[PDB]
């Protein structure tokens, strides 16, 4: 994959189900799990528009 490349800059928030990064000037959405509230759920704008499902690592809840 990546072998010893040290890539600079701030790191982006990673989408919690597709690893699509919330890039600068595009605003995703970060919230807490609606069923538990323990884990965080991150949705990039692409996944929000496409309606990509998300799963809680702790509970078995799949939301928009």
């Amino acid at each position: 994959s990546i072998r010893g490349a040290r890539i600079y800059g701030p790191s982006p928030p990673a989408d919690s189900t597709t690893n699509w990064p919330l890039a600068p000037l595009e605003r995703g959405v970060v919230f807490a799990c609606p069923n538990c509230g323990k884990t965080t759920i991150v949705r990039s704008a692409r996944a929000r528009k496409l309606g990509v499902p998300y799963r809680c690592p702790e509970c078995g809840f799949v939301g928009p």
Binding site: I2, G4, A5, R6, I7, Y8, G9, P10, S11, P12, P13, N19, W20, P21, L22, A23, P24, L25, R27, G28, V30
Partner: protein, 194 residues
């Protein structure tokens, strides 16, 4: 200054002291004052200035369209456009939109003819496009320099890149589109699924 918009309130209250945290947590900048607060070392350059006219019954009504590139020379760049009846407020509008549209740029090595682990070039091969100008940025060995066009060199230097190889397609004489495509590629460095 009044910290209109709540992000500006936190930025003037010092709860956010660095520009890196905004782009780390996906925060949207709606005001330029946050940018001048968090990046006092911001250099702005006038990349292009074209005269633009509308036809009317009494004759053409001219307006300046100024393109401005802002950058910290350390991996932060943005480009903005401003149309105004006079050049001064046209440049002011372009500077404000550049400050609003500033974004981080990922840097590194990755050229096959280099081994240094410095931010001198782009980390991987990236592409950008604006209308029909397509610009591919390629990592280069250290010491080569900027091997792009002049406005591309200005944008890359403002973004804090030392060496790169470019591959362009389409009419690069459209200075606005060339600048926008280069800035688009630099912003597309963050769309790479690492």
């Amino acid at each position: 200054w009044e910290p209109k918009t709540a992000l500006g309130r936190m930025v003037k209250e010092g709860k956010i002291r660095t520009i890196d945290e905004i782009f780390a947590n996906n925060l949207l900048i709606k005001e330029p004052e946050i940018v001048d607060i968090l990046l006092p070392g911001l250099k702005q350059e006038l990349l292009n200035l074209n005269l633009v006219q509308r036809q009317t019954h009494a004759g053409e009504r001219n307006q300046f369209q100024a393109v401005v590139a802002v950058g910290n020379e350390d991996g932060y760049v943005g480009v903005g456009i401003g149309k105004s009846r006079q050049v001064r407020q046209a440049i002011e509008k372009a500077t404000r939109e550049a400050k609003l549209n500033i974004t981080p740029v990922r840097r590194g090595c990755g050229s096959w003819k280099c081994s240094c682990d410095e931010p001198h070039s782009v980390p991987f091969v990236v592409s950008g496009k604006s209308g029909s100008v397509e610009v591919t940025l390629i990592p280069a060995p250290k010491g080569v320099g900027l091997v792009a066009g002049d406005v591309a060199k200005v944008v890359l230097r403002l973004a804090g890149i030392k060496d790169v190889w470019t591959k362009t397609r389409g009419d690069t004489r459209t200075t606005l589109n060339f600048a926008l495509a280069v800035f688009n590629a630099l912003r597309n460095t963050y769309y790479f699924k690492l």
